Amino acid sequence: MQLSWKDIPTVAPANDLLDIVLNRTQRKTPTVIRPGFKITRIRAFYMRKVKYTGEGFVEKFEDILKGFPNINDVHPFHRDLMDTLYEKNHYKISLAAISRAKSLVEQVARDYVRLLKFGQSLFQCKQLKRAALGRMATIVKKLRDPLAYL
């Protein structure tokens, strides 16, 4: 048995998580693209933006999901103690919300990379990338209460 669950990384709230992931994308990916460049270069630029933001959100969600104990799989004494302390129903519902948000972020990333494969201009590629990031942001903003609870 594990018997101790202190080694769980900090869970940022919705707005702070959004700031962390989006500013990490803006800092760690190149930011200068020109309308006079090749359309392949423009498409690759915006695809990299979408894919990196999706990976950041997914790895934050996976760090949340792996850290917390499995309430049903632990010893029954620990299960009953954590049910009394934290309401096992709310516990599982919040973690399932995190997992579903991870799946939705992955789907948005895949769909918008596939759509960015057919971009015809810098304006269109920029709009598709902004759409992907905005949909990811809406998904993350829907997690305001489970993140605080967790």
Binding site: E87, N89, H90, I93
Partner: protein, 67 residues
């Protein structure tokens, strides 16, 4: 690129009667699929209305409404 004013845009395009709904609902369930029959053309039907199956159990209640 213009769209002219017309009252055909605001009319109903497809309707189904209650008898037709009941006929298709009873037919869906009595089909005996043959392995040597292939689908040449699918009929266009309101499958969301026609696909209603009796379930023995109900889903769990949403606890976040009350707590």
């Amino acid at each position: 690129a213009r769209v002219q004013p017309d009252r055909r845009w605001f009319g109903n395009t497809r309707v189904i009667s209650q008898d037709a709904l009941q006929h298709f609902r009873s037919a869906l369930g009595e089909t005996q699929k043959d392995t040597y029959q292939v689908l040449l053309r699918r009929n266009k039907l309101p499958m969301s209305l026609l696909e209603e199956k009796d379930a023995d159990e109900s889903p769990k209640a949403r606890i976040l409404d009350t707590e």
